[PDB]
Protein backbone atom coordinates (compact mmCIF):
# COMPACT_ATOMS: atom_id res chain seq x y z
CA UNK A 1 0.00 0.00 0.00
CA UNK A 2 2.97 2.32 0.69
CA UNK A 3 4.01 1.04 -2.75
CA UNK A 4 0.70 1.44 -4.65
CA UNK A 5 1.58 3.21 -7.97
CA UNK A 6 -0.20 6.46 -6.95
CA UNK A 7 1.21 6.47 -3.38
CA UNK A 8 4.73 5.70 -4.71
CA UNK A 9 4.59 8.56 -7.29
CA UNK A 10 3.44 10.93 -4.49
CA UNK A 11 6.34 9.81 -2.25
CA UNK A 12 8.81 10.37 -5.14
CA UNK A 13 7.21 13.79 -5.81
CA UNK A 14 7.62 14.82 -2.11
CA UNK A 15 11.14 13.25 -2.09
CA UNK A 16 12.40 15.63 -4.85
CA UNK A 17 15.54 17.51 -3.76
CA UNK A 18 15.31 21.31 -3.36
CA UNK A 19 16.61 23.70 -6.03
CA UNK A 20 20.38 24.13 -5.49
CA UNK A 21 20.61 27.92 -5.82
CA UNK A 22 24.03 28.86 -7.33
CA UNK A 23 24.93 31.91 -9.43
CA UNK A 24 27.33 32.76 -12.25
CA UNK A 25 30.64 34.46 -11.38
CA UNK A 26 30.64 38.26 -11.85
CA UNK A 27 33.60 37.69 -14.19
CA UNK A 28 33.13 35.91 -17.55
CA UNK A 29 33.67 32.13 -17.49
CA UNK A 30 37.19 30.70 -17.78
CA UNK A 31 37.98 26.95 -18.03
CA UNK A 32 38.84 26.98 -14.29
CA UNK A 33 35.80 28.91 -12.97
CA UNK A 34 33.20 27.08 -15.13
CA UNK A 35 34.58 23.73 -13.87
CA UNK A 36 34.65 25.11 -10.30
CA UNK A 37 30.99 26.21 -10.64
CA UNK A 38 29.92 22.84 -12.14
CA UNK A 39 31.83 20.65 -9.62
CA UNK A 40 30.70 22.81 -6.65
CA UNK A 41 27.10 22.41 -7.92
CA UNK A 42 27.54 18.64 -8.45
CA UNK A 43 28.95 18.11 -4.93
CA UNK A 44 25.97 20.03 -3.43
CA UNK A 45 23.57 17.94 -5.56
CA UNK A 46 25.46 14.78 -4.46
CA UNK A 47 24.62 15.65 -0.80
CA UNK A 48 20.93 16.03 -1.76
CA UNK A 49 20.93 12.88 -3.97
CA UNK A 50 21.76 10.70 -0.93
CA UNK A 51 18.86 12.26 1.06
CA UNK A 52 16.55 11.76 -1.98
CA UNK A 53 17.57 8.07 -2.24
CA UNK A 54 16.90 7.52 1.50
CA UNK A 55 13.26 8.69 0.94
CA UNK A 56 12.54 6.09 -1.80
CA UNK A 57 10.44 3.46 0.10
CA UNK A 58 12.58 0.39 0.92
CA UNK A 59 15.98 1.89 -0.10
CA UNK A 60 17.25 2.14 3.52
CA UNK A 61 15.99 -1.48 4.03
CA UNK A 62 18.52 -2.62 1.37
CA UNK A 63 21.92 -3.88 2.48
CA UNK A 64 24.38 -1.06 3.20
CA UNK A 65 26.65 -2.63 0.53
CA UNK A 66 23.84 -2.26 -2.08
CA UNK A 67 22.96 1.34 -1.06
CA UNK A 68 26.63 2.35 -1.56
CA UNK A 69 27.25 0.60 -4.89
CA UNK A 70 23.95 1.80 -6.45
CA UNK A 71 24.67 5.48 -5.65
CA UNK A 72 28.35 5.06 -6.68
CA UNK A 73 27.23 3.51 -10.00
CA UNK A 74 24.42 5.92 -10.98
CA UNK A 75 25.19 9.39 -9.56
CA UNK A 76 26.48 11.09 -12.74
CA UNK A 77 23.52 9.72 -14.77
CA UNK A 78 20.96 10.85 -12.14
CA UNK A 79 22.68 14.30 -12.09
CA UNK A 80 22.38 14.45 -15.89
CA UNK A 81 18.74 13.22 -15.82
CA UNK A 82 17.97 16.07 -13.39
CA UNK A 83 19.72 18.61 -15.67
CA UNK A 84 17.76 17.49 -18.76
CA UNK A 85 14.40 17.77 -16.94
CA UNK A 86 15.31 21.31 -15.73
CA UNK A 87 16.37 22.16 -19.33
CA UNK A 88 13.47 20.39 -21.18
CA UNK A 89 11.45 23.56 -22.00
CA UNK A 90 14.55 25.68 -22.93
CA UNK A 91 16.10 24.72 -26.35
CA UNK A 92 19.82 25.52 -26.79
CA UNK A 93 20.40 25.95 -23.02
CA UNK A 94 21.46 23.89 -19.99
CA UNK A 95 19.73 24.95 -16.74
CA UNK A 96 22.35 23.66 -14.28
CA UNK A 97 20.69 25.86 -11.62
CA UNK A 98 17.94 28.59 -11.67
CA UNK A 99 20.63 31.34 -11.66
CA UNK A 100 23.25 29.16 -13.50
CA UNK A 101 21.92 28.97 -17.08
CA UNK A 102 24.53 28.17 -19.76
CA UNK A 103 24.10 28.53 -23.52
CA UNK A 104 25.51 25.71 -25.71
CA UNK A 105 28.36 27.91 -27.07
CA UNK A 106 29.61 28.81 -23.53
CA UNK A 107 31.01 25.25 -23.25
CA UNK A 108 33.78 26.37 -25.68
CA UNK A 109 35.83 27.76 -22.73
CA UNK A 110 36.26 24.28 -21.14
CA UNK A 111 38.25 21.78 -23.28
CA UNK A 112 36.25 18.65 -24.22
CA UNK A 113 32.99 19.66 -22.46
CA UNK A 114 31.21 21.00 -25.61
CA UNK A 115 30.78 17.50 -27.06
CA UNK A 116 29.10 16.43 -23.76
CA UNK A 117 26.85 19.57 -23.78
CA UNK A 118 25.68 18.55 -27.30
CA UNK A 119 24.88 14.99 -26.10
CA UNK A 120 22.94 16.46 -23.15
CA UNK A 121 21.07 18.97 -25.36
CA UNK A 122 20.39 16.38 -28.11
CA UNK A 123 19.01 13.87 -25.55
CA UNK A 124 17.00 16.67 -23.83
CA UNK A 125 15.45 17.57 -27.23
CA UNK A 126 14.26 13.95 -27.72
CA UNK A 127 12.62 14.12 -24.25
CA UNK A 128 10.95 17.45 -25.24
CA UNK A 129 9.78 15.85 -28.54
CA UNK A 130 8.19 13.00 -26.51
CA UNK A 131 6.65 15.57 -24.07
CA UNK A 132 8.17 13.91 -20.99
CA UNK A 133 5.83 14.45 -18.04
CA UNK A 134 7.08 15.34 -14.53
CA UNK A 135 5.71 12.09 -13.01
CA UNK A 136 7.27 10.01 -15.83
CA UNK A 137 10.56 11.83 -15.07
CA UNK A 138 10.31 10.95 -11.33
CA UNK A 139 9.82 7.21 -11.99
CA UNK A 140 12.59 7.10 -14.63
CA UNK A 141 15.13 8.88 -12.38
CA UNK A 142 14.36 6.39 -9.56
CA UNK A 143 14.74 3.54 -12.12
CA UNK A 144 18.25 4.82 -13.04
CA UNK A 145 19.30 4.52 -9.35
CA UNK A 146 17.71 1.11 -8.76
CA UNK A 147 18.70 -0.54 -12.09
CA UNK A 148 22.37 0.62 -11.87
CA UNK A 149 25.54 -1.45 -11.23
CA UNK A 150 20.63 -12.37 -0.72
CA UNK A 151 17.47 -10.86 0.84
CA UNK A 152 18.76 -7.43 -0.35
CA UNK A 153 18.79 -8.46 -4.05
CA UNK A 154 15.14 -9.63 -3.70
CA UNK A 155 14.18 -6.34 -1.99
CA UNK A 156 16.07 -4.45 -4.77
CA UNK A 157 14.35 -6.36 -7.61
CA UNK A 158 10.96 -5.85 -5.91
CA UNK A 159 11.65 -2.13 -5.36
CA UNK A 160 12.75 -1.76 -9.01
CA UNK A 161 9.57 -3.64 -10.08
CA UNK A 162 7.34 -1.24 -8.06
CA UNK A 163 8.87 1.91 -9.62
CA UNK A 164 8.49 0.29 -13.08
CA UNK A 165 4.84 -0.52 -12.24
CA UNK A 166 4.40 3.14 -11.23
CA UNK A 167 5.76 4.37 -14.61
CA UNK A 168 3.37 2.04 -16.49
CA UNK A 169 0.55 3.45 -14.30
CA UNK A 170 1.53 7.11 -15.03
CA UNK A 171 1.61 6.30 -18.79
CA UNK A 172 -1.82 4.57 -18.47
CA UNK A 173 -3.27 7.82 -17.00
CA UNK A 174 -2.97 9.45 -20.49
CA UNK A 175 -5.72 7.12 -21.84
CA UNK A 176 -3.94 6.35 -25.14
CA UNK A 177 -4.21 2.89 -26.77
CA UNK A 178 -2.37 -0.12 -25.23
CA UNK A 179 -0.18 -0.16 -28.39
CA UNK A 180 0.80 3.49 -27.85
CA UNK A 181 1.45 3.10 -24.08
CA UNK A 182 3.94 0.33 -24.94
CA UNK A 183 5.58 2.46 -27.67
CA UNK A 184 5.83 5.43 -25.29
CA UNK A 185 7.32 3.17 -22.59
CA UNK A 186 9.94 1.81 -25.03
CA UNK A 187 10.74 5.32 -26.39
CA UNK A 188 11.39 6.63 -22.83
CA UNK A 189 13.52 3.66 -21.71
CA UNK A 190 15.55 3.56 -24.97
CA UNK A 191 16.61 7.20 -24.33
CA UNK A 192 18.35 6.10 -21.08
CA UNK A 193 21.13 4.46 -23.14
CA UNK A 194 21.95 7.97 -24.45
CA UNK A 195 21.88 9.44 -20.89
CA UNK A 196 24.14 6.59 -19.70
CA UNK A 197 26.46 7.27 -22.66
CA UNK A 198 26.60 10.96 -21.71
CA UNK A 199 27.34 10.04 -18.04
CA UNK A 200 30.26 7.76 -19.04
CA UNK A 201 31.75 10.61 -21.15
CA UNK A 202 31.10 13.10 -18.32
CA UNK A 203 32.85 10.81 -15.80
CA UNK A 204 35.88 10.35 -18.12
CA UNK A 205 36.04 14.11 -18.75
CA UNK A 206 35.84 14.94 -15.00
CA UNK A 207 38.60 12.39 -14.20
CA UNK A 208 40.84 14.04 -16.83
CA UNK A 209 40.17 17.55 -15.41
CA UNK A 210 41.11 16.26 -11.92
CA UNK A 211 44.39 14.55 -12.99
CA UNK A 212 45.46 17.52 -15.18
CA UNK A 213 44.79 19.83 -12.14
CA UNK A 214 42.40 22.09 -14.11
CA UNK A 215 40.19 22.02 -10.97
CA UNK A 216 40.43 20.75 -7.37
CA UNK A 217 37.43 18.61 -6.33
CA UNK A 218 36.46 18.07 -2.68
CA UNK A 219 34.21 16.30 -0.21
CA UNK A 220 31.66 13.83 -1.66
CA UNK A 221 32.43 14.43 -5.35
CA UNK A 222 36.14 13.68 -4.67
CA UNK A 223 35.24 10.47 -2.78
CA UNK A 224 32.79 9.21 -5.44
CA UNK A 225 35.39 10.02 -8.10
CA UNK A 226 38.33 8.34 -6.26
CA UNK A 227 36.10 5.24 -5.92
CA UNK A 228 35.34 5.12 -9.71
Amino acid sequence: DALSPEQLVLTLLEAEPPHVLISRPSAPFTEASMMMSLTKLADKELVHMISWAKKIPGFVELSLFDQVRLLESCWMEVLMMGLMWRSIDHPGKLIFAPDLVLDRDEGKCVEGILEIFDMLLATTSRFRELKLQHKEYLCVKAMILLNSSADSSRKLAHLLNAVTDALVWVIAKSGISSQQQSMRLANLLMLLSHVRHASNKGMEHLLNMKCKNVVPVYDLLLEMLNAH
Partner: peptide, 12 residues
Protein backbone atom coordinates in the same frame (compact mmCIF):
# COMPACT_ATOMS: atom_id res chain seq x y z
CA UNK B 1 33.46 5.43 1.20
CA UNK B 2 33.48 7.32 4.56
CA UNK B 3 31.43 10.42 3.56
CA UNK B 4 28.83 8.40 1.57
CA UNK B 5 28.36 6.03 4.56
CA UNK B 6 28.01 9.01 6.97
CA UNK B 7 25.38 10.69 4.77
CA UNK B 8 23.56 7.30 4.39
CA UNK B 9 23.52 6.88 8.22
CA UNK B 10 23.41 10.51 9.47
CA UNK B 11 20.23 12.52 8.76
CA UNK B 12 20.57 16.21 7.78
Amino acid sequence: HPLLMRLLHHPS
